[PDB]
Amino acid sequence: KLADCSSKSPEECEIFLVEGDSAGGSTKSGRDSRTQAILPLRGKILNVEKARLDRILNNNEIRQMITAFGTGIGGDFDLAKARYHKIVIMTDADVDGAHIRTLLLTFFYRFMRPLIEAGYVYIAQPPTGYKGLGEMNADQLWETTMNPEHRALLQVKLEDAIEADQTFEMLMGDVVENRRQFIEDNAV
Amino acid sequence: KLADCSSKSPEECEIFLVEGDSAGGSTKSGRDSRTQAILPLRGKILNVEKARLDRILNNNEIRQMITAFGTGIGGDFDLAKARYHKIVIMTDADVDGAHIRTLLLTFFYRFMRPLIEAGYVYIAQPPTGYKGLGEMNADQLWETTMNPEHRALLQVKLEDAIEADQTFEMLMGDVVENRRQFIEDNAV
Amino acid sequence: INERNITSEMRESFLDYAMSVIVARALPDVRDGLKPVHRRILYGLNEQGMTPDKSYKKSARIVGDVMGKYHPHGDSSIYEAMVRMAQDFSYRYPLVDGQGNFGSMDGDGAAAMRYTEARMTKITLELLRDINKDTIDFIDNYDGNEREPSVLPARFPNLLANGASGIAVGMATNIPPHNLTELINGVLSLSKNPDISIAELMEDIEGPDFPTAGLILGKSGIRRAYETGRGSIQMRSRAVIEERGGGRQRIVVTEIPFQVNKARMIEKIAELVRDKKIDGITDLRDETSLRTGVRVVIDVRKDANASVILNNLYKQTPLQTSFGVNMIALVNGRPKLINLKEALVHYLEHQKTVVRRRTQYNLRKAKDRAHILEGLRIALDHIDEIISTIRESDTDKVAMESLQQRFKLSEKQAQAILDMRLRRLTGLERDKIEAEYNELLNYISELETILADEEVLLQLVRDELTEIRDRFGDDRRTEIQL
Amino acid sequence: ERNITSEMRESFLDYAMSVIVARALPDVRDGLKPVHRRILYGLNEQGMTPDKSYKKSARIVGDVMGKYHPHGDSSIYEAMVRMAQDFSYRYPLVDGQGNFGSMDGDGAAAMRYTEARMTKITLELLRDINKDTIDFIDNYDGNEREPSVLPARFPNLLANGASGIAVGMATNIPPHNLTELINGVLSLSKNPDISIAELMEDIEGPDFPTAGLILGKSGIRRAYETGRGSIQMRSRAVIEERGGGRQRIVVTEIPFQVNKARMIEKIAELVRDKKIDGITDLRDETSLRTGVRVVIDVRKDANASVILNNLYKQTPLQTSFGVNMIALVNGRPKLINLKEALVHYLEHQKTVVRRRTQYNLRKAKDRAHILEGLRIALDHIDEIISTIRESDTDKVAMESLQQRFKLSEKQAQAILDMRLRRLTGLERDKIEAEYNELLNYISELETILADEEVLLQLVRDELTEIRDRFGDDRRTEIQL
DNA sequence: GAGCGTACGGCCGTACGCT
DNA sequence: GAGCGTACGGCCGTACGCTT
Ligand SMILES: C[C@@H]1CN2c3ccc([N+](=O)[O-])cc3CC3(C(O)=NC(=O)N=C3O)[C@H]2[C@H](C)O1
Ligand SMILES: C[C@@H]1CN2c3ccc([N+](=O)[O-])cc3C[C@]3(C(=O)NC(=O)N=C3O)[C@H]2[C@H](C)O1
Ligand SMILES: [Mn+2]
Ligand SMILES: [Mn+2]
Ligand code: NA
Ligand code: NA
Ligand code: NA
């Protein structure tokens, strides 16, 4: 499923976690095949905060990311075994893109935490509008979000470990009621 | 994916070979599940007058038709092993529907000839209509072409084995030029 | 490069999704009882004029219009929704008139979108009735290219008639279908007494009336759900114990509960016989045809009591199921848990406002028209002077000045006169203008009566609700046992 | 009971027939197969003109499917996609946005993911379609009407070409330069008995969107002479000299209908199989700004000229275009040569332009009739009015106006429908001014229909306009 | 304990004629 | 050869809440 880059030098390599197959196709043509790898995401990823480890580890989408990062997870997590020094979350500029993005960050924080602490994880910044990713051509798609000289990335930083742990458990945990509250409290 | 009938008495049973996967499902809900079986046909079927035997016997569709009839093909063909005493060709009312009929009648004539001589081969008759068979529901599909009382089945009959032998050879064979001149002479 | 806090990102993003799913995907509006996608099939049907009187249009085409003009989401979420609206075993009052294979109770999917046909039902005209007479607000669509209605007039109370069952975020909703004849009577009774109690409203509305019929056990659950907005209702299949000859016994199921897959119900019984968790059952058949309807036959061995088997089937298979009410609708753009009265009060309020805005729109146009007619009467009373005034004129611009100045006419009135045709000068035609003006003066007064007094409008609402009740009202399907 | 020979004979003929004339072969007039025409026409009826915004594909298809094309969506959408691809069409007919695939065999993103409208040149195919220039017919259900052919104000069949497989026969016509085609239609118009060899003085040979090279004029000649020939297509490649005695091959243009990525696979297969050797690396550097560019690096010892020549032979770096010029002519298929091809087209333009001028006549005279009654009315407007006033009903005024002022029904009706603002001076002049102009226009239109050369010259004049707005450089180099 | 109902596609067979 | 281009769909992942 993943289309890898030709380079085997992690420090200059970067992988893009793209939403939907149609965008994953065009990103695969517009990319810089030397440095940039594309791992498509065919929809709504597993929420690992609600799944038990046997269901998480058997989950194909999750299984493909672990292999593609090649660091392993849990107590067997080595930052030196990483194949990419930039992991970029690239989702549509709509609310479902936002959701996928929350699901990925949940996986990462719960299983590859020191991958966030090192600043390896990034959020892509596609063009705002009604049009999504699968609707752009490969070239305007390369230029707007993938080209290092013109692109804008959001480097993900973990500033407060204890506060985040409380944030993931509320938003994505299995207790619904605390979620509801947060919605009603901030609903605009 | 053949859907078979409850009754194991070939004399009263009948198999419907229907065009398209859509007409398959509707037909399956509309059928007398006791005596009526359905073998859907995913699109155009192999022209066997054009292929060498090794492709034929390895052709998933041609495979599913033999397994269903249970009679073997060619010289090994055994009329007593026939699981159905009616084999009804159900295709759309349109031109492609006719093509798939000729294609079927070619296989039947070239590997299951005694099945035609024994008058087991029937052609169904949906209404002359711009509508396909897939488009019409289960009830319309059963009330118009599948119930014994209301249906009009043309029993397919063979009269001259030497004429037929050269017709298939010409219409379905390798040589294009002979099929060009047939078109030319007979088309207006 | 810019730096984004992971915590902040998780709150801001997830709140966008959460909120979006709530007010704009998963929950119906308390007014028209529709989720966004639904509204847009109906409107799309309407803007194409796929009314009942015109032949079916291909499902392919409908979905495209709806997706390209209003609903920027995948084709299947639109289609499946339309197919649900065409199912007589899903909707108490079907909103879509479908042709071909639109799926069954056995849970088999509708045939693909190219293999089906669709238009509106006659009742859906009523959801859209009076839509163009400034009754409902319009807003821009996703791209700004088109316009779409924020709500539908909904001249019958649809939230309660067809129900709802949407899973959102941090909440979900589950409202059962109700009989229309009962629902409207309830509305009426609320229109005459603002302080009517729930238990009184339940004289009109006995309870939910599923499209699938069957049986409801006790009224105890209906009240809780109707008073608080939450509560459990026990649905039981209609099954009778037939006795054939002396020895033999047969258990025939004719109605099954709502949202209960028939094939999957049957399999569960086949499962229990196979695993020997239920004794007595010889055969098990599904004789469901169109004319007979649902018919599931269970053959029972002699010396085995059908009643013990039947009761044990209730407890063990979905032959008896609970309906967990959770009436949550969008109220003033926010999600809200509403009881039967709140449901009804909000609808009537919607209706009052829709009739009043209708009346206001009809008055404006009416007052506008009579103005034109007045100028036209003035003209035809002084025709030769008028003609003279226009011919004298070099252009049409000065013709207006010269007519406004000379006969005391508005800009509007001089335009109507300059836009009049010579065939308006015949003798019969003068009479028509005098007629049209006379009725119209009488019509403006009728309207001005309605807008000044709350009760005439109130009655007009009642009167029109009663028209829906008669034309479309039907007998109760679901028996309620005590 | 049905005879098995009979059933086969009839049923197969049924299929065949329809595929020949309602599927796989283009018409000689507008150069279009049924599905293409139905997509363009639907774009038109939807008003999907270049000046308006794009429209999502799924909607265009959805309409085209339901109104005119009773078949699967994939056959429709893929066809349109093709028309949008600048590497398939020498003069693309669809203007599409988003992903419409590549030369690398890349599919186009599904209907929902792409939007589309018509190109400016597609307007010329549809020009005058509403001026009774072409005959309409019923659709497959009788509920809509659709064209049998488009006016086609530029020679589409030879411009964009056609390649389809039928039953009993197939077709394969290469794309040409438009400027060359038109100029060849102009020479034909001036000389009905003009020779194939002389026409080629304009039309040099094909002209693929993908540029490239054609080896010699022998194929081209045979092609245009017989309607069947073989034309060699060769990639544009150069061997450039590099330091330390190294070399590399750079390929900047590839053959028509050749999958770029699949050609490269074949070069690499021959390197893994060691069927060819001397090649150190193989890069596809195709960018938007350089376009196509495949780079082949060469081992110092090897001779890169030998390598390149062996590649032409061993991969689709050089490919044949097998010309089989069969179009539908009078609704039957026919092997035709360059001249019949142009001759049926020119004849199509002479009909379109006639029927148009014919249409504009019936409309001019019809209007002029009405204006006359309006002029009358304007010269006695005092008595026209009172005459209407003395009338009880519109019918009496109709009767009175006709009897008194020697008017027709269309003229009386027109006067009745007259708006008082026409009586202002400026509008009174406008009515005279329109009449006068219209009279001189009917003159012009009656010149045209009365002399076959004036007509023919019109055709020439409009074709030359198209040439000067859409004509472009030739892309394919024909080598001797 | 499983499922209800709006959201986020690509793999693959065949006929047909020609170099 | 094979593959040009118009024709003739199923399967099965996820979030999310409430309730079994
Ligand atoms: C109705 C289709 C179903 N679908 C499926 C189906 C099965 C599987 N499956 O793997 O079994 C995955 C998906 C993901 C889906 C898709 O097909 N592409 C995509 O990128 N986004 C999606 O949501 C998703 C698609 C958007 O919608
Ligand atoms: C574009 C699709 C492709 N398609 C395919 C594709 C793959 C396979 N396959 O199995 O590889 C079979 C078919 C048959 C097809 C068709 O023609 N008829 C049908 O009933 N269903 C279909 O999908 C046929 C379908 C009508 O059209
Ligand atoms: Mn999106
Ligand atoms: Mn068909
Ligand atoms: Na139970
Ligand atoms: Na019509
Ligand atoms: Na070659």
Side-chain angles (χ1 to χ4, degrees), chain A residues 2-7 9-33 35-130 132-156 158-188, chain B residues 1-7 9-33 35-80 82-134 136 138-142 144-156 158-188, chain C residues 2 4-222 224-249 251-275 277-290 292-301 304-396 398-404 406-407 409-481, chain D residues 1 3-300 302-394 396-402 404-405 407-436 438-464 466-480:
Chain A
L2 153 94
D4 210 334
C5 44
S6 61
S7 185
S9 175
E11 50 269 23
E12 64 172 1
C13 285
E14 50 195 43
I15 182 175
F16 288 71
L17 302 158
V18 185
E19 173 184 349
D21 272 313
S22 292
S26 290
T27 49
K28 270 172 185 196
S29 310
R31 57 159 178 172
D32 192 295
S33 299
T35 57
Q36 299 170 341
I38 310 297
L39 175 51
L41 297 181
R42 0 175 44 203
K44 293 299 180 73
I45 296 314
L46 194 96
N47 179 3
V48 297
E49 188 93 7
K50 288 186 204 171
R52 299 286 179 182
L53 191 88
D54 57 278
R55 192 221 167 93
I56 288 171
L57 279 171
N58 290 332
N59 189 256
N60 316 87
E61 327 296 300
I62 288 294
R63 204 144 186 79
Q64 239 150 68
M65 270 185 297
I66 304 186
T67 309
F69 301 152
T71 61
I73 47 165
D76 291 75
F77 175 82
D78 197 7
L79 293 92
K81 299 270 290 283
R83 216 190 314 271
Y84 312 90
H85 275 46
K86 297 193 170 67
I87 298 89
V88 189
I89 304 177
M90 180 178 185
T91 41
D92 275 31
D94 56 71
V95 297
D96 293 76
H99 194 210
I100 303 178
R101 179 158 79 256
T102 50
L103 290 158
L104 290 174
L105 282 161
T106 297
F107 169 68
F108 289 162
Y109 183 78
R110 288 298 173 183
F111 292 91
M112 300 161 189
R113 189 133 150 220
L115 198 70
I116 286 166
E117 291 171 38
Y120 283 27
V121 174
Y122 297 88
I123 297 165
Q125 286 217 97
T128 312
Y130 62 96
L133 248 28
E135 310 182 23
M136 312 179 58
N137 96 306
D139 258 280
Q140 88 201 105
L141 190 59
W142 148 252
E143 278 290 276
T144 348
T145 333
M146 305 205 64
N147 181 18
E149 292 148 14
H150 272 186
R151 72 176 177 202
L153 302 164
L154 288 168
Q155 185 180 46
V156 189
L158 175 68
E159 283 161 38
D160 187 315
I162 318 145
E163 185 203 11
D165 171 48
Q166 290 184 123
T167 305
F168 281 93
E169 182 188 340
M170 171 191 61
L171 303 172
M172 329 293 294
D174 44 274
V175 51
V176 177
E177 231 292 329
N178 289 311
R179 218 196 316 280
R180 197 195 70 80
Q181 285 199 1
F182 166 78
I183 289 172
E184 205 191 19
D185 288 350
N186 295 258
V188 165
Chain B
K1 256 175 286 96
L2 153 139
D4 206 347
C5 63
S6 305
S7 174
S9 179
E11 182 108 52
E12 66 172 342
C13 293
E14 55 204 9
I15 186 164
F16 283 96
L17 310 162
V18 312
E19 217 201 307
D21 267 320
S22 293
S26 296
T27 298
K28 266 121 131 192
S29 172
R31 60 157 159 148
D32 171 28
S33 188
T35 58
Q36 291 180 328
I38 294 120
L39 181 60
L41 285 180
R42 283 198 183 101
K44 295 310 172 86
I45 174 59
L46 205 68
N47 177 6
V48 297
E49 266 282 336
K50 272 194 182 176
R52 288 174 188 286
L53 189 76
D54 65 346
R55 188 182 174 176
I56 302 191
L57 292 179
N58 199 99
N59 196 268
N60 254 322
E61 236 74 4
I62 305 290
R63 279 314 291 171
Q64 284 170 56
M65 273 201 293
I66 296 176
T67 303
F69 301 159
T71 67
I73 45 149
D76 298 13
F77 171 92
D78 182 40
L79 190 64
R83 303 183 66 247
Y84 316 95
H85 282 193
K86 273 155 161 44
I87 295 104
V88 194
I89 304 182
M90 208 162 93
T91 52
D92 289 21
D94 47 57
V95 277
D96 309 80
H99 194 209
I100 301 170
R101 181 166 50 248
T102 71
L103 292 165
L104 282 191
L105 293 182
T106 289
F107 170 63
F108 289 156
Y109 185 83
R110 285 300 184 196
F111 292 84
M112 297 175 181
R113 172 119 141 243
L115 201 60
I116 303 181
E117 301 173 340
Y120 287 4
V121 181
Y122 298 81
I123 290 164
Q125 255 191 340
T128 85
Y130 60 159
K131 220 111 318 143
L133 298 201
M136 81 182 58
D139 300 84
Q140 0 182 356
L141 204 48
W142 151 262
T144 58
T145 37
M146 281 195 76
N147 178 248
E149 273 189 351
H150 302 20
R151 74 193 198 192
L153 302 183
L154 312 159
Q155 184 177 262
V156 193
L158 173 63
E159 278 135 58
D160 188 13
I162 264 180
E163 188 173 78
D165 256 76
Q166 295 174 40
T167 296
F168 284 103
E169 193 185 329
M170 167 180 70
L171 297 188
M172 315 301 287
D174 272 23
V175 182
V176 173
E177 336 197 50
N178 304 344
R179 182 172 35 244
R180 174 171 27 244
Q181 279 190 115
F182 173 66
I183 292 182
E184 260 186 58
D185 298 337
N186 283 49
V188 189
Chain C
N2 247 346
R4 174 65 158 174
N5 186 322
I6 204 192
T7 300
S8 284
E9 184 72 2
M10 284 288 317
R11 334 197 59 194
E12 258 143 85
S13 301
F14 189 75
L15 185 55
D16 280 22
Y17 181 71
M19 274 304 293
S20 186
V21 172
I22 292 171
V23 302
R25 196 177 281 173
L27 320 161
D29 205 294
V30 64
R31 302 177 297 198
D32 63 345
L34 305 186
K35 316 214 186 76
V37 52
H38 290 296
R39 231 174 270 110
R40 287 151 168 187
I41 289 142
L42 301 186
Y43 185 65
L45 291 177
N46 189 54
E47 287 289 294
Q48 295 305 118
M50 263 307 146
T51 53
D53 55 285
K54 306 179 198 159
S55 60
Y56 298 96
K57 210 227 291 208
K58 226 187 213 350
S59 290
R61 203 158 135 199
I62 303 169
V63 159
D65 266 319
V66 179
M67 165 180 349
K69 287 152 96 198
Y70 319 112
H71 203 67
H73 302 287
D75 56 335
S76 65
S77 307
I78 303 180
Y79 185 63
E80 278 178 307
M82 181 183 99
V83 174
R84 249 189 61 89
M85 291 191 290
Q87 288 178 352
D88 61 284
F89 55 83
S90 311
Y91 279 58
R92 186 57 182 79
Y93 301 103
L95 304 194
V96 169
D97 186 347
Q99 169 108 105
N101 194 28
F102 278 77
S104 72
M105 308 189 184
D106 268 24
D108 48 290
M113 185 177 15
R114 333 179 324 238
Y115 302 78
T116 52
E117 259 162 71
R119 69 206 184 184
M120 309 170 214
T121 72
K122 303 178 181 178
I123 214 187
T124 313
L125 289 180
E126 300 301 314
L127 289 169
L128 303 136
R129 204 169 88 161
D130 303 324
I131 188 176
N132 293 320
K133 306 166 197 182
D134 198 38
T135 38
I136 51 93
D137 304 39
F138 285 84
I139 53 164
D140 280 22
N141 69 334
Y142 62 101
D143 51 10
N145 271 14
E146 333 271 347
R147 294 277 283 191
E148 69 191 339
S150 61
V151 63
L152 280 217
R155 304 314 312 279
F156 71 85
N158 188 59
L159 176 66
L160 283 176
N162 278 325
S165 44
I167 307 158
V169 183
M171 57 203 61
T173 173
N174 194 30
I175 306 160
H178 298 89
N179 185 285
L180 202 46
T181 316
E182 296 189 10
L183 279 178
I184 296 160
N185 290 341
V187 184
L188 296 176
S189 295
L190 166 74
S191 71
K192 304 161 179 172
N193 167 9
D195 288 329
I196 186 173
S197 73
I198 318 281
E200 196 171 350
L201 285 174
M202 288 183 63
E203 283 181 57
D204 295 297
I205 308 164
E206 299 186 12
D209 178 50
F210 306 114
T212 45
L215 286 72
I216 275 179
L217 306 172
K219 274 201 175 183
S220 167
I222 305 189
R224 211 145 51 224
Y226 277 2
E227 302 252 24
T228 59
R230 305 210 164 109
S232 238
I233 312 184
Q234 283 297 320
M235 308 171 307
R236 187 173 290 171
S237 320
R238 168 152 292 175
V240 288
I241 295 180
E242 307 180 343
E243 323 221 347
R244 337 188 42 232
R248 315 135 78 78
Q249 224 143 74
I251 300 177
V252 183
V253 187
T254 59
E255 297 153 20
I256 63 167
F258 185 59
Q259 282 167 312
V260 163
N261 190 321
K262 168 152 66 68
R264 191 188 283 117
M265 178 195 84
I266 292 164
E267 163 80 356
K268 283 290 192 59
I269 306 167
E271 177 197 291
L272 293 171
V273 174
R274 151 163 51 236
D275 299 342
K277 294 197 170 189
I278 191 140
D279 62 326
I281 295 170
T282 334
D283 195 19
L284 172 62
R285 303 178 303 285
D286 179 12
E287 298 182 13
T288 287
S289 85
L290 188 70
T292 7
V294 171
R295 183 187 169 88
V296 203
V297 207
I298 303 172
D299 276 342
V300 166
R301 299 191 221 262
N305 199 227
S307 219
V308 192
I309 299 164
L310 172 60
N311 294 349
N312 282 322
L313 284 167
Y314 292 148
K315 304 173 182 174
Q316 294 184 54
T317 51
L319 194 75
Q320 186 178 310
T321 314
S322 62
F323 193 114
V325 183
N326 188 19
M327 288 192 293
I328 299 189
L330 285 169
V331 175
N332 270 309
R334 305 159 234 169
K336 185 188 180 201
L337 173 54
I338 69 190
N339 57 73
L340 178 59
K341 177 171 182 166
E342 305 206 22
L344 292 158
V345 161
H346 278 101
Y347 171 63
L348 187 66
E349 215 68 31
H350 182 57
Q351 287 301 274
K352 287 152 68 199
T353 301
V354 158
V355 171
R356 99 199 322 124
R357 288 185 47 171
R358 172 176 91 182
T359 309
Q360 290 197 280
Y361 169 92
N362 292 342
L363 198 69
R364 275 199 315 276
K365 301 301 152 174
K367 287 190 90 178
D368 274 10
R369 173 63 180 163
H371 183 74
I372 295 300
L373 280 166
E374 281 164 3
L376 294 181
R377 275 155 79 250
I378 288 183
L380 303 166
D381 278 335
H382 313 298
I383 323 181
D384 295 325
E385 297 114 280
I386 292 286
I387 303 294
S388 170
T389 302
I390 296 156
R391 295 173 72 198
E392 284 178 29
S393 297
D394 288 24
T395 70
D396 55 356
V398 317
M400 288 247 306
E401 277 264 69
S402 301
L403 285 168
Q404 290 185 44
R406 178 156 161 168
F407 293 80
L409 305 158
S410 59
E411 183 172 357
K412 303 257 199 174
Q413 280 155 333
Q415 270 305 339
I417 294 170
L418 283 202
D419 288 325
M420 215 203 309
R421 322 200 117 160
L422 284 187
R423 70 168 70 245
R424 230 98 121 87
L425 275 51
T426 38
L428 210 180
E429 279 277 2
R430 165 57 178 190
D431 288 340
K432 293 180 174 182
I433 286 191
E434 199 55 36
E436 182 186 1
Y437 183 70
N438 276 333
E439 292 157 49
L440 220 97
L441 277 175
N442 186 30
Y443 182 76
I444 294 169
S445 90
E446 291 181 29
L447 297 170
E448 292 209 282
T449 296
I450 291 182
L451 298 149
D453 184 10
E454 305 299 329
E455 179 64 24
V456 235
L457 150 118
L458 239 320
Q459 188 55 42
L460 185 68
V461 170
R462 294 184 199 119
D463 284 335
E464 274 174 335
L465 283 179
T466 314
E467 251 146 44
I468 306 303
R469 193 189 69 191
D470 295 313
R471 175 168 28 163
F472 294 110
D474 58 340
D475 334 70
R476 167 164 286 278
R477 289 167 180 182
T478 300
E479 183 175 316
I480 302 189
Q481 314 219 307
Chain D
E1 56 186 317
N3 174 277
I4 228 286
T5 296
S6 298
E7 181 58 33
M8 284 294 305
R9 289 181 132 267
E10 279 160 48
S11 285
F12 182 83
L13 190 70
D14 290 24
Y15 176 72
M17 289 297 286
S18 162
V19 180
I20 287 144
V21 308
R23 203 167 277 193
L25 298 162
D27 188 288
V28 64
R29 294 174 294 179
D30 57 5
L32 294 182
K33 304 182 197 185
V35 63
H36 295 98
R37 194 183 303 108
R38 286 181 188 171
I39 294 165
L40 298 191
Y41 175 69
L43 290 165
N44 202 50
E45 299 295 298
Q46 288 147 56
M48 292 310 314
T49 63
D51 57 318
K52 325 267 213 58
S53 75
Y54 291 105
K55 179 191 196 203
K56 302 193 64 76
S57 299
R59 262 188 82 205
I60 293 168
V61 169
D63 273 72
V64 165
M65 200 188 137
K67 302 227 201 66
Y68 335 104
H69 212 39
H71 313 104
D73 52 287
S74 202
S75 319
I76 302 150
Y77 177 69
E78 288 176 0
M80 193 189 83
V81 164
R82 288 230 307 130
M83 282 185 285
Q85 287 169 352
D86 62 316
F87 47 81
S88 315
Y89 273 67
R90 189 61 189 71
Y91 298 98
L93 305 179
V94 162
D95 172 23
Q97 193 159 61
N99 170 39
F100 279 81
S102 66
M103 312 192 176
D104 286 339
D106 273 322
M111 290 190 311
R112 338 205 309 268
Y113 293 86
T114 67
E115 48 205 22
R117 73 191 154 190
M118 81 175 66
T119 58
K120 280 172 194 181
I121 200 147
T122 316
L123 283 180
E124 305 294 345
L125 284 182
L126 282 154
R127 238 181 78 166
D128 305 329
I129 186 168
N130 287 317
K131 292 175 172 185
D132 190 38
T133 32
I134 58 94
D135 303 317
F136 277 74
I137 47 156
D138 300 339
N139 64 343
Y140 72 101
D141 56 30
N143 307 2
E144 323 275 357
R145 295 273 293 182
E146 64 161 342
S148 89
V149 64
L150 313 188
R153 306 308 310 264
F154 76 97
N156 204 28
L157 183 73
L158 293 171
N160 276 305
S163 80
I165 308 150
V167 192
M169 59 210 57
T171 181
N172 203 49
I173 304 150
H176 298 80
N177 193 271
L178 181 65
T179 311
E180 288 179 350
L181 281 171
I182 282 171
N183 291 330
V185 189
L186 294 175
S187 300
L188 176 51
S189 62
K190 294 173 179 181
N191 176 15
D193 309 323
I194 196 176
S195 89
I196 303 279
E198 191 184 325
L199 281 167
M200 289 186 44
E201 279 190 59
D202 289 304
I203 309 175
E204 293 190 5
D207 185 22
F208 313 106
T210 59
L213 270 86
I214 301 179
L215 313 180
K217 297 172 186 184
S218 76
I220 301 162
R221 282 236 38 182
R222 167 108 194 149
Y224 297 162
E225 284 280 7
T226 59
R228 290 181 59 50
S230 196
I231 301 184
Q232 290 304 294
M233 296 174 287
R234 181 176 282 182
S235 327
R236 180 167 295 279
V238 295
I239 306 160
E240 51 185 63
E241 304 297 313
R242 297 179 67 78
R246 290 256 221 150
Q247 289 182 323
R248 74 181 182 187
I249 302 179
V250 191
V251 186
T252 50
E253 293 164 25
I254 66 156
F256 186 53
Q257 296 180 315
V258 164
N259 197 313
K260 177 166 62 70
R262 160 188 290 149
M263 170 182 83
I264 282 168
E265 288 169 39
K266 191 73 204 98
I267 298 182
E269 266 171 38
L270 286 194
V271 174
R272 89 167 213 254
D273 281 26
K274 297 197 287 179
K275 299 233 210 75
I276 198 158
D277 207 68
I279 308 177
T280 63
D281 193 32
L282 185 70
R283 299 183 299 271
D284 192 354
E285 289 181 11
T286 301
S287 67
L288 194 64
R289 74 167 194 82
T290 61
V292 181
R293 164 185 175 91
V294 179
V295 168
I296 301 184
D297 267 319
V298 171
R299 162 175 62 93
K300 179 172 182 170
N303 188 221
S305 44
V306 179
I307 302 189
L308 184 48
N309 288 22
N310 282 329
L311 278 168
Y312 293 145
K313 197 51 179 153
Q314 290 181 248
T315 68
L317 205 63
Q318 189 184 297
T319 327
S320 142
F321 195 97
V323 168
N324 190 22
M325 295 213 283
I326 288 173
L328 288 167
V329 175
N330 285 355
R332 73 188 250 163
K334 263 194 62 187
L335 197 68
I336 82 202
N337 62 46
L338 186 76
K339 177 148 156 193
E340 309 196 38
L342 288 158
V343 153
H344 291 307
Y345 175 60
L346 178 51
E347 223 60 29
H348 180 58
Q349 296 293 273
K350 288 168 70 175
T351 305
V352 154
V353 159
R354 197 186 296 104
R355 295 178 61 157
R356 181 192 73 206
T357 296
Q358 278 188 336
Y359 168 90
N360 293 329
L361 195 59
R362 301 197 302 267
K363 298 299 156 173
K365 294 188 182 162
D366 277 12
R367 177 66 174 152
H369 185 80
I370 292 293
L371 293 172
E372 283 172 350
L374 291 188
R375 268 145 98 269
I376 297 174
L378 277 186
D379 306 316
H380 315 293
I381 195 57
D382 300 284
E383 334 160 39
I384 280 303
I385 290 163
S386 45
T387 297
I388 294 168
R389 276 216 281 172
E390 80 177 18
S391 300
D392 184 27
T393 64
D394 289 344
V396 169
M398 280 271 297
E399 180 189 73
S400 299
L401 281 174
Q402 286 173 56
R404 221 184 118 154
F405 306 82
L407 294 170
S408 63
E409 268 167 53
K410 287 175 170 185
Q411 273 165 1
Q413 198 86 269
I415 288 172
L416 280 159
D417 288 337
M418 197 163 82
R419 294 205 189 184
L420 293 180
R421 61 166 70 264
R422 309 266 151 270
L423 291 203
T424 65
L426 269 208
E427 301 303 320
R428 274 192 278 115
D429 293 323
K430 278 190 175 171
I431 279 183
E432 170 72 4
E434 183 188 349
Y435 190 73
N436 280 313
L438 195 58
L439 283 179
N440 179 30
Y441 178 54
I442 291 170
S443 189
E444 210 197 32
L445 296 170
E446 281 173 340
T447 305
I448 280 172
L449 297 179
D451 187 26
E452 266 280 17
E453 168 70 19
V454 170
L455 164 106
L456 194 68
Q457 176 65 43
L458 182 57
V459 172
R460 305 186 185 173
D461 294 338
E462 276 164 349
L463 269 170
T464 316
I466 313 284
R467 196 192 69 198
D468 296 339
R469 184 168 40 164
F470 295 107
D472 66 335
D473 281 297
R474 142 171 292 277
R475 295 190 180 177
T476 300
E477 176 169 347
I478 297 181
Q479 282 200 326
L480 286 92

